[PDB]
A paper describes a structure:
Dihydrofolate reductase (DHFR) is a critical enzyme in the folate pathway; it is responsible for the NADPH-dependent reduction of dihydrofolate (DHF) to tetrahydrofolate (THF). The folate pathway plays an essential role in cell survival by generating 5,10-methylene tetrahydrofolate as a one-carbon donor for the synthesis of deoxythymidine monophosphate (dTMP), purines, methionine and histidine. Disruption of this pathway leads to the critical deficiency of these key molecules, impaired DNA replication and ultimately cell death. Designing antifolate compounds that inhibit MtbDHFR enzyme activity and also the growth of live Mtb is a promising strategy for TB drug discovery and development.
Author numbering:
A (entry chain C), B (entry chain D), C (entry chain B), D (entry chain A): 1 to 159
């Protein structure tokens, strides 16, 4: 099973200037609970954007995709291709517009957080993958972040 | 398949003052059995620690990590990076607190010997890596050494 | 008795870019009629959106909800929690999509103005709370303002 | 009208370790049909034990009892006393041994699901209230669950 997990603004924006352009502790919680105890796969830019304190992410097998000869990622496994990255029976892809796009054909689950903020796409943004009719989903109830953000969870699957 | 194999006191101590701080022939025999005929990888200080009589370890392809590029290890292969070292399909990492920690993300097997002795950690000790919940393990029965060391075997795996 | 009072487009939009996206003096008169001489509760953003001319709103006890421990609201009562805000026996919760959603469980009345204008929801809009079957309603007759927009009043109650 | 609704093993056990110690979808459907569109009242521990996706329970006015003035229950009404909680003309008390025991004197209906499983009481279990002879009752016919659980419904009343 390969799953994708991401958080997006309604626009589809997931990253900008090497960071996630909102703060949502509830989503961090959600992400940790899905991914804990499992192999996680991320592109190297996502690895760079991890806060130093949680790089590598604790309690997970961190796998970092890089097309660069000897990229160094202390505490993670660096691999050079998707075939090498996607071999664990429960794999969560967490990381990168580029790596979402490339790994999606291998995926049978998506766990999506939608954040209800106005955030129009800009050139160079990292974007969420667009899901087609092969997928079926369930939509969760809208909620308010205990800070103020409105957000909701989606769970998609295909067989 | 990259595997780790080590022997630790209950405390996690695997090395002190450049040597293993206990005597256990049965563990030596277990180590020999697992590693014979395979590629073994060790850090440079583990190489220095090998008794001269078995440096390099016979019947194994000895691979030594150093970032001293011109380092000389007669009878072994010296490499300067982890990716250079971990390319044999059955690889056993045998050697070093540091190299265990750095190689662990690449590993899907751990073969552990626990030695039931009181040996509290001291600053500068080499330590065994701590395994998180990505692993499943089987615990062997306690037994006594050729003399009276109580010891156990563990086998850990993840996929 | 806690009540909510709001005006929405048919779409459910009540605010955009910090302002109410329509002009309707008849609604303003309805609002003052209902709230005059009572305690009103609003979120900080709604307080900020009040025209300076009527901030605080005259003839009502203005209560403002803020998570900012030090927030200043001259002429209003700043409180840090919902419990502290909803203590008056007749309380009218006035704007704020956030504060509407959070106060709704405490409420037994809703006084709603619906504005018949095409105004599709956009990301980050403030939205009216959606009312479930715990509520009973009464619908008022459609009418035109001297403006040019159709509106009508709803009155909702539960015990 | 205050009613109690609960599901119990034959032994009286309704909760253990923060959860209901069985799965019975048919009971969930039964609970939903009785409580939908009404006020529901629950102790704080029952609130915590709700699956996050149905917290608060949809289509019902959720009321949570806590001896904490501070306590926060997003999407629910937190109250500090029984008198504050039981003021709706149709109230269903849904939760927890201690709120069952405390609210029972206010109640004139009980809707009970009995689950035919061997589940002896353990210290600290949450238990169903004991019904004395003030009540009259009707017993439903035994049914097998779609999973294979044997359960039946009881309806109790007093005036
Ligand atoms: N909101 C969310 O849920 C998340 C948001 N983000 C945001 O996403 C942004 C980063 O996404 P992005 O910029 O697209 O970069 P990625 O994080 O996707 O990593 C991209 C890099 O991974 C390497 N890579 C990708 N695919 C392969 C492959 N198939 N084989 C080998 N190497 C590969 C590439 O190397 P080369 O360039 O050599 O091809 C590329 O440089 C950041 O802003 C981050 O904060 C990150 C994670 C989740
Ligand atoms: N009980 C057991 O099962 C075992 C115990 N031991 C004990 O462990 C101790 C050795 O532990 P340690 O001191 O950690 O020995 P090491 O694993 O540290 O050998 C370390 C060497 O590997 C090279 N190296 C340094 N940084 C990196 C890097 N970032 N990536 C790759 N290679 C690198 C360097 O060689 P250079 O310095 O030349 O650059 C470094 O000094 C000894 O006391 C030994 O007896 C050893 C094996 C098993
Ligand atoms: N059409 C209508 O009927 C009305 C429409 N509106 C529109 O609504 C929009 C603003 O609504 P919205 O954006 O939802 O923000 P709100 O007006 O609901 O106020 C939100 C703020 O309330 C504060 N707060 C403190 N504690 C709490 C708490 N426990 N629960 C909730 N809020 C708390 C925070 O302020 P801090 O950040 O200081 O902590 C938070 O940012 C504006 O566009 C306004 O014009 C406004 C009024 C009526
Ligand atoms: N099988 C079934 O039908 C059901 C089973 N359950 C199970 O029941 C168990 C929980 O029941 P229980 O442990 O008895 O806890 P409760 O759910 O009864 O809630 C107890 C809490 O309610 C608050 N409370 C109780 N009495 C008062 C009062 N008089 N005034 C103010 N606050 C009050 C306190 O909250 P604070 O501590 O914040 O002061 C107290 O800790 C769980 O295992 C749950 O899964 C729950 C519902 C139905
Ligand atoms: C929490 C963000 C997130 N949400 C969802 N739904 N899917 C994702 N794939 C990511 C992601 C990511 C990368 C990332 C992780 C984290 C992070 C920090 C701590 C923990 C944890 O303690 O478990 C997890 C993720 C922080 C920042 C960050 O990018 C800047
Ligand atoms: C036997 C020690 C050991 N046990 C386990 N379970 N895992 C390990 N990785 C090592 C190790 C090591 C390094 C080392 C090997 C040996 C050794 C000696 C003989 C043989 C052999 O005959 O095969 C193998 C290793 C001796 C000393 C020594 O450190 C000082
Ligand atoms: C009159 C708008 C309104 N209608 C209903 N039915 N329910 C509400 N809760 C609000 C409201 C509100 C907050 C608010 C009041 C006003 C307002 C402004 C001016 C005057 C006045 O000058 O008379 C009165 C109210 C303006 C903006 C505004 O949010 C942006
Ligand atoms: C179905 C459980 C139940 N049965 C009966 N006969 N009486 C009760 N009071 C409760 C209860 C309760 C709390 C609770 C509700 C639910 C639940 C989930 C969904 C729905 C729904 O969709 O309506 C309702 C209750 C799930 C778990 C749970 O405790 C762990």
């Amino acid at each position: 099973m390969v799953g994708l997990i991401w958080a997006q603004a309604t626009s589809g924006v997931i990253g900008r200037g090497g960071d996630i352009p909102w703060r949502l502790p509830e989503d961090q919680a959600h992400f940790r609970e899905i991914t804990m105890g499992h192999t996680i796969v991320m592109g190297r830019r996502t690895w760079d954007s991890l806060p130093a304190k949680v790089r590598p992410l604790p309690g997970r097998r961190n796998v970092v995709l890089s097309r660069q000869a000897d990229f160094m990622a202390s505490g993670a496994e660096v691999v050079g291709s998707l075939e090498e990255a996607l071999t664990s029976p429960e794999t969560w892809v967490i990381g990168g517009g580029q790596v979402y796009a490339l790994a999606l054909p291998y995926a049978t689950r998506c766990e999506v957080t939608e954040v209800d903020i106005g955030l129009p796409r800009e050139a160079g943004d990292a974007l969420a993958p667009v899901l087609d009719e092969t997928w079926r989903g369930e939509t969760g109830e809208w909620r308010f972040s205990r800070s103020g953000l409105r957000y909701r969870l989606y769970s998609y699957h295909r067989s």
